Each structure stands twice: as structure tokens, then as C-alpha cells.
Design a protein around this ligand. Structure first.
Ligand SMILES: Nc1ncnc2c1ncn2[C@@H]1O[C@H](COP(=O)(O)OP(=O)(O)O)[C@@H](O)[C@H]1O
Ligand SMILES: Nc1ncnc2c1ncn2[C@@H]1O[C@H](COP(=O)(O)OP(=O)(O)O)[C@@H](O)[C@H]1O
Ligand SMILES: Nc1ncnc2c1ncn2[C@@H]1O[C@H](COP(=O)(O)OP(=O)(O)O)[C@@H](O)[C@H]1O
Lengths: 367, 367, 367
């Protein structure tokens, strides 16, 4: 009876036992299906492939991310990767111990109900509970106060927290980064004549975004530092072995986070939406928030993301006030680290909802 | 009730029981007819001669290959050699056990319908099935993934296969090699004043192509190695006993496979049509294909065919990617070996189409 | 000094003066070369043949389309047909008046730079400008708002436009139809035993696609209306005079536009990619787009293309919303009609880029 904690994070899905610095299974969430006729009468093949099992054989497969923007669109597949994650990958019987379940702040409640559902009547679990993406970033980072920033592939949001008292009216969820950053990248790369568009190749694109993006850090002279002289163009061999040439859009793709007029969806931009989240907070409360903003999203490894937020957030706010963006490298597992902390420790053991409670009222109880 | 598996391969036709490393009957497909007046009132003679029965007595006979380019032009004769192959040669009653039937990838379906037909209403067979030339080369070679190359006398084609999921849109059939290689050879040999043109002598020509051709392997200095100094000219006694002198065209005849501007039919050439087949495949899928291309056609014994493909395919593709052309000597029976494997093993026993199915819908069901 | 407007459209290339309902030169874009030895010592022959000059004598020639998918792969030939189009065909000095130049929405900018280049230093032109395939379809159709659909031989794309404010993030370019539709047709016709594969004969195939294709319009019962009873099979005499039999694939070839699992390249299909373009547009903006979608591609004359889009687009979208697909017959010249409108009218006269501007900064200015 030890806690295992899993996440919905689209992208990679991450699950492991309580009391550990990293989950035992980290694999992308995909339900793949063959788009071609079976020749191998060898029925050793499968209906569909999930995770790395699918991620290994790609161009053959078609790829469906079940987690759209934090909301989960397709349930039938989604239960499979859970059905997998409990059995293969990390190998556990479905009934041992409860599970803390990561989940999105502002998403529709109908998300978490069917999800609490299929954690019971299909395969019964010794209770359950569902926390929020951000609230576990502090249990991980150990802070009590402070605003967060979370992105990941599922959705980008920030949840200012002070002494474990949330400020829900200030929670700002703008859906961006994540997948939507590649879909701009597949869009932009055609500048150099690379036509990448198919469901299976998309990840080949992503592994560019992984390797070289960073953040422009005042990309005015940066484009001119790209345009005029070329020192920053790097080449990336791709699974066939052919060279790719880049560097005008290397920084330019993540730059869209600060000007979503590149991607075309017009809302805010991520740097000041934290500010425009702070301003909605109280006058008193905000002094330390500027110092404590953690920015652990799981997207942002960009070498110089934090460095530009420093520049941009100081351009906002009164300059007399010290702002500190902590960028711990152990993030991208952070939201999971909180699980292996929160559920591991106690005073939470009565915060689970047992199958009783689901028999008590119903799925509506989690709210 | 044991499976016997036969092929359409024009050229030699090959048939034998399941579970064997080589068919029991390998004989060329010809329906011969006498072109002269019968003197022997001895009616012990026949209407027509088939296979080696014909191949023994040639200049007397006229030779008609019923299998044109994989497509079978003449049915009336074609059923005879089948009518033979079941009775004489390998001696079996027409009704014992089903038969797997080899057949061409891109050929018109009207090919395989009349062929499935005459496997029923004329002589009834306990079910049936028709596979593809290439798909059985992997069951033989044991590979699962990998692109093929098949030529034979019937037609040349390549069918990239990955985990027994075919890539039909990438199947490249260019009709070449086979018979059409001799018809260039009978064309080229007149260089030395050998006028070979008659239907019966054509095979005398072929037995040169059998013995000495190889492949030029960068035949730029090769022609100059032919022209300038003569070390490579070899002589071949022919059924009368007269010497033949060759060697400028020894390599030059199969060389046409890489430049079908010698034969005059302009399409591609065989080396890069595999490449131009690969490129049509997916970006991901293609890494291993370059390593796995089997080139088992039944034509290609040419000592140094594989050696030049190595040279030519590396001249294509990104050089950072390892390409491996496997050239197993057991080929030329390969496409049959697959039959004695596939049909021998099980999960295929329900993949036959019983005479029921032909009574169910009709010949259209095989598709 | 009157405007002449030309297009890149692969396929046919179309050019003519401003202020006209149709270009003065409509001829296919090919640079042909003889694949055989010259016998006529008569040097009256040429290095290469372009356009109809080539299109007249085909089997002799080899055919290279310089415009691949909107992108132009071969420049050296491409300048010839321009070099022709200015001199022969429409007969004009290279220096009279600027030229509006049609061009693809999402193609790499390196396309249009070398193209703006060779409009200056090789032959100098009184300024220049390059518009987009779609944006001129409204100036032709006279609409201001509305989404388009464009295909042609070069590439298929749709560019929703509202009050002359483009929605670039919603521009959906999937490369399909055009040439790639024949290459499936040459692939499919072998069903009936017609082996058409050579570079010169390809157009013989195309002239079938011209004559009889239409669109299946719910081709479920249609195939059964083909299979079961044969009323729709039509015959086409080909340049030798021999009959062709068709009709199972008559509708089936353009049908691939709605299911590119026939051609094998898996992306979307053209009917809903407009929908999946609309959905990416704003909630407000989309009411009228459904009414205004023009579908002028230059491919689509298919008798019943618009009729099935009606069926399919209504199957998508809320049914409470009126959708109207206008299919003006004057299209296929439409993208050119816009030129003879846009450039003819004024407020555009300062939108040209004079040779000054190219001397100002360089080719990078067009962006
Ligand atoms: N080094 C990196 N550079 C840029 N982007 C990255 C990097 N590492 C991960 N990402 C992006 O961040 C995502 C993290 O996904 P994940 O953390 O599972 O989402 P969530 O936070 O919703 O769980 C990856 O899928 C990838 O798209
Ligand atoms: N050693 C060799 N060298 C050159 N050509 C050969 C050699 N052996 C066979 N061939 C050619 O390859 C053909 C193989 O025919 P076959 O395998 O029956 O065609 P298919 O593959 O369609 O069944 C022979 O008919 C002959 O023309
Ligand atoms: N009546 C028709 N039926 C089917 N296809 C057609 C018909 N007319 C033209 N096409 C196809 O549409 C193409 C139009 O080419 P074009 O308009 O020059 O391309 P672009 O739009 O890029 O300029 C032709 O080359 C032909 O392939």
C-alpha cells in the first residue's frame, strides 16, 4: 500500500510510486494505429500501439494525442494508456493503493468526473484524489508562498499561491506553448523548404524544438544578429540522415510565447499574463510574489527563458521592487515531484476520496 | 493434404510441396509447336510440347512464353503447363490440397480472376489463395521489415515492407530485365556478327546471359578496360560447337538495368527506383529500409550486382546513413521458399479462399 | 507601358496584358529534351523544346516540369519559358512595363528571391511585384470577404480572406491534386492493363482526367452503381486510335481529394481542411465564410465537385448555418484574372518594387 501518482500532462505522461525523486515511467502519450494494410498474417501485431511502443514505430503509425488542451477529448484510447501504465511500464496490480492524479486548473469539471469515474467502475481503485497542476509545484519546490508558471504540452497557466491559500480569481489560463508551439514550428520551417506535415513526423519536428530553441532575450538585434551575420545557424541530422539548416527561426519559435501574434491566437503573452495575474491580486500580497515566481512548466528548458522574463517583468512592475524568477532544473518533473511529496506525507491520508464517497454521492463529490 | 505452391514467374516455373527448401519441379514455361510438316506418320508425336519436353527439342519447335510481363497473355496454353505441373513433373491428383499461387504486385486484376477461375471450374481445387511476388521474399529471408527488389523474367518491381505492413503507394513496378534483357542481348551480339534471331535459338542466347554477364561496377574505365586491353573476352561453345567471342558487351547487357537508355525504354533504372521508392516512403520509416533491401529477383546472380548497388545507392541517400544490400545466394527460389514457409505455417489456414467463397460471391473476392 | 501578368502555376502557365478577361498565352510548362540520337544533321533542330513547341512532339521528347509543388526546383530551364513567354508566344520586349507575378502562399521564401532576382540582373524589368495565388481570386470574383480554395497543378491551399485582411495563421496548404492526381491515375489504370508509364505519355493520361472524372458525390452506392450495373463506362480513343475502357476509376481518381488514403499521403482531405481552416478562424468571423467559399483552383472542373462539397461541408459545421459554395466556370483563369484586375486598377502603382528597391536593399525586400 504505497502511493503511485500519475499525470494527464499530454506530451509525456509521468507516473511512479510515492517517495521518489522521479517517476518510474516517463513516456509520451499516444495511441497509434496502422494506416496501411496488414501483410504479416502473423497476428502477433496489435490493434493499436501506445506510448513508446508506438513512439518506436512511427511513420507506419498514425498518432493521436488523447489529451488536447488539458481537457481529454478521447476517453476510449485514454483509458488504454492508463490501462497500460498500471500493467506494463510500471508493473502493478490495479488494486493496491490510491493514486493522486494531476489535473488542470480551469478546465471543465466534466473533464474530472468521467476521469474519476473510470478510476472506479471499470477498474476499481482504493480511493483516489485529484490535485491541480500548479499546487504541487510548491510542495516540490518546497515554497509556501509564491506565484507559479506552468505550461507543459497540455496548457499554460499560472496560479499565484500564498501560504497555501489559493487566489482562484487571479488564476490565468491561456492555452499556448506545448504542442501549439510545434504547430507553429512546422508552420515556420517551410521557410527553408522542409515540408514536415504528417501526424507521425510531428515529433521529428519536436526533437528540433527540444534541441535548439532557447529564447531570443531581446530579439530585436537578435534577428539582425541572425540576418546580417550567421554565427548561430545550427544543423540537425534527422532520422534519414539529411542535414537541416535553421537559425532564423531557432529563437523565433518560442518567442511566440511573448508575442502570440506570431502564432495568431491573440490573447496576451506569457510574460505579462503573470503580471496581469499579479495586478489582479491584492496590493499587499504582491511584494513577495514578484520574488517567488517559479516558472516550472515542463516546456521551459529554453536556455534563457528565465533570463528574458527577468528583463520583461522588470520592464513591468515598479522597478523599486525586487523580482526573482527561480528556474530550478529539476522541473518538468516538478508537477510529479509534488505528488511523491504531498501524497507521501500525512494529513493527506484523510483527504483521499474512498470508493465509499463515490458510492456516497457520486462523481460530483470531487468539486 | 499438404500444401503445394506454384509460381507464374514466366521463365522457369517452380512448384513443390509445403515444407521444403526447394521445389520439386523447376522447368521453363514454354508451349512449343512444330513449325514443319509431320513425316513420322507415327502418331506418337503430340499436338504441342511444354516445358523441358519442349526445351529438349527446340529448333524443330516454335516457342511461346505464355507469361508476358507478369500478365499472362495466352490462357489456353497456360492451363496446359498447369495441367502438366499437377499431373506430370510433380505427380499429384488435381484434388488433394490447396495451393498458394505466386503473382505480380501491380498487374491488372483481370490477370488474377481468370486465373482463380481456371483453378476451379475446369479442375476443382480444395480452396486456393494468391500472394504477391515480394511479400514471400521476407517470409523466406525471415526478415519482417525491409524493402525488396524483385525482377525475374516476368517483371521487375520493389515492394518496401515494414513489420508486415505494406506501403502500396510506394510500390514501384518498372517492367525490365528478364526476357527483355536477352532481347537487348540478341540485339547487341550482332556487333560481332552472330545473327541469333529465331524463337527457338533465343534460349541459346540466354545461356550466354546465364554464364557470363556480371555487372560492370563503374563501367567507365571498364569499357576502356575492355576496349584498350583484352583480358576479359571469354569464348562460349554453342550447341553446334562453334566458338563465340564476346566481352565488350559481357558487362554491357545487364548494365542496361542501370541505364535503360541502352534498351531504349526510358523510365528510371533499377538502382535508384528503389531510392525513388524509398523517398516516397515516410521520413521515419526509411532508416532501416536502406539497411534491409534484399534484392532477390531470380534474375540477379550477376557477380557484382550487389557490389554496384552498394556503390550507386550510397551515391544517393545521405551518406551518414548505413545502407546494406543483402544478396543471399539461395534466392531465385526465394519467392517460392516463402510459399513453402507461409502456407506451411498456420494462422494462414483460414486465409485460404475455399470453393465456397467462389460460390459465395465470385472471382472478385480475391481482391 | 501596360501591365503583363504571368503565373508560376506549373501545369499550364498563363500570361497576358492588363485589362483583359483571359491571358494571351496559355500553354503548359515543360522543358523537353530529345532522348535519342540526332540523325537530321539539319541543325535546324534545337537544344530543348518548351511549352507547346515541346507539347506537340512528345514521345521523342522527355518532359521536365520545372515547377514541382509551387516551389520551382530547376531554375535554368524555368528562365527559358519566361525567356520564351516574353519573346515568343506573347511577343514583347523584356523592358516595357512591370509584371505582377503569381506565387504560392506557404512556399519557402527562397522560392521568391531568386525569382525576383532573375527578373532583374539577367533581364531587367521596370520594377515588379509578387502576389499570392488566392488573394487574386477575390479581385477576380469581385468578393471582398470569403475563404478560397485553390489547387491547380502546383499545390492545393485555401486562404480565408475577410475585408482584405488575411488570416495567415489559418492558411492551410496541403500539397495534393494537380500532377499528383494523375500519378495516382497512371497508378490505378493498370487495373485494366494499360501500362502508361513514361514521362511523355503522362499527358495522354492527363487528357483522360480532363475529359471524364467528375466527382463521385457519395460514392458508396456509386462504386456499387459501377460494379453491379455498367452504364457509366466510357471509352476514350488515344493518339494511336486504340480504345480504352474505364469507369470503375472514373470517379475514383478525384475522389482521392476527399480521402488521401487512396493516394497514400495521409494528411486531411480537401473538403474538411477548409472546415479545419475555418475552425481555426474566429467564432464571429466564420458565419459568412461558409457562404463565400469560392473553390477556384484551376484543377476543379469536375462535374459535381461543388455538389459533393455542399454535401460534405454541411455534414460538418452546425447545420443551422447556411453554406454556399460558388463555382464560377470562368475559374482556372481566375488567379490570372485577378492580375489583370489588381494591376490594372490603381493604388497599386506604388505597390510595385522598382529596380531601385532591389538596388536599395536586395531580394529580401519582397517579404
Ligand atoms: N528542452 C526542451 N526545450 C523545449 N521544449 C521542451 C523541452 N523539454 C520538453 N519540452 C516540451 O515540454 C513538454 C513537457 O510535457 P509535459 O511536462 O508532459 O506537459 P505537462 O506539464 O502538461 O505534463 C514536452 O512535451 C515538450 O513539448
Ligand atoms: N546466373 C544468372 N545470370 C543472369 N541471369 C539469370 C541467371 N539465372 C537466372 N537468370 C535469369 O533470371 C530468370 C529467373 O526467372 P524466374 O525467377 O522464374 O522469374 P520470376 O522471378 O518472375 O519467377 C531466368 O529466366 C533468367 O532469365
Ligand atoms: N476539366 C478538368 N478536369 C480535371 N482536371 C483539370 C481540368 N482542367 C484542368 N485540370 C487540371 O488542373 C490544372 C490547372 O493547372 P493550373 O491552373 O495552371 O495550376 P495553377 O492553379 O497552379 O496555375 C491542369 O494542369 C489540369 O491538371
Amino acid at each position: 500500500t504505497t502511493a503511485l501518482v500519475c499525470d494527464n500532462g499530454s506530451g509525456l505522461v509521468k507516473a511512479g510510486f510515492a517517495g521518489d525523486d522521479a517517476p518510474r515511467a516517463v513516456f509520451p502519450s499516444i495511441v497509434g494505429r496502422p494506416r496501411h494494410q496488414g501483410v504479416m498474417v502473423g497476428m502477433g501485431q496489435k490493434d493499436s500501439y501506445v506510448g513508446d511502443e508506438a513512439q518506436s514505430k512511427r511513420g507506419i503509425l498514425t498518432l493521436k494525442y488523447p489529451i488536447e488542451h488539458g481537457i481529454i477529448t478521447n476517453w476510449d484510447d485514454m483509458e488504454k494508456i492508463w490501462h497500460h501504465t498500471f500493467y506494463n511500464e510500471l508493473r502493478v496490480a490495479p488494486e493496491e493503493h490510491p493514486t493522486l492524479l494531476t489535473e488542470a486548473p480551469l478546465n471543465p469539471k466534466a473533464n474530472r468526473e468521467k476521469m474519476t469515474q473510470i478510476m472506479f467502475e471499470t477498474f476499481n481503485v482504493p480511493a483516489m484524489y485529484v490535485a491541480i497542476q500548479a499546487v504541487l509545484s510548491l510542495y516540490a519546490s518546497g515554497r509556501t508562498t509564491g506565484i507559479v508558471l506552468d505550461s507543459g504540452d497540455g496548457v499554460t497557466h499560472n496560479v499565484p499561491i500564498y501560504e497555501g491559500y489559493a487566489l482562484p480569481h487571479a488564476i490565468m489560463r491561456l492555452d499556448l506553448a506545448g504542442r501549439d508551439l510545434t504547430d507553429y514550428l512546422m508552420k515556420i520551417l517551410t521557410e527553408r523548404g522542409y515540408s514536415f506535415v504528417t501526424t507521425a513526423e510531428r515529433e521529428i519536428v519536436r526533437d528540433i524544438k527540444e534541441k535548439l530553441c532557447y529564447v531570443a532575450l531581446d530579439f530585436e538585434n537578435e534577428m539582425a544578429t541572425a540576418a546580417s551575420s550567421s554565427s548561430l545557424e545550427k544543423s540537425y541530422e534527422l532520422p534519414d540522415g539529411q542535414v537541416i539548416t535553421i537559425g532564423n527561426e531557432r529563437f523565433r519559435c518560442p518567442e511566440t510565447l511573448f508575442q502570440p501574434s506570431f502564432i495568431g491566437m491573440e490573447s496576451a503573452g506569457i510574460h505579462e499574463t503573470t503580471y496581469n495575474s499579479i495586478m489582479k491580486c491584492d496590493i499587499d500580497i504582491r511584494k513577495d510574489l514578484y520574488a517567488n515566481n517559479v516558472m516550472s512548466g515542463g516546456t521551459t528548458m529554453y536556455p534563457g527563458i528565465a533570463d528574458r522574463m527577468q528583463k520583461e517583468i522588470t520592464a513591468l512592475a515598479p522597478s523599486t521592487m525586487k523580482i526573482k524568477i527561480i528556474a530550478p532544473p529539476e522541473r518538468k518533473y516538478s508537477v510529479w515531484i509534488g505528488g511523491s511529496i504531498l501524497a507521501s506525507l500525512s494529513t493527506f491520508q484523510q483527504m483521499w476520496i474512498t470508493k465509499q464517497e463515490y458510492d456516497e454521492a457520486g462523481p460530483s463529490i470531487v468539486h
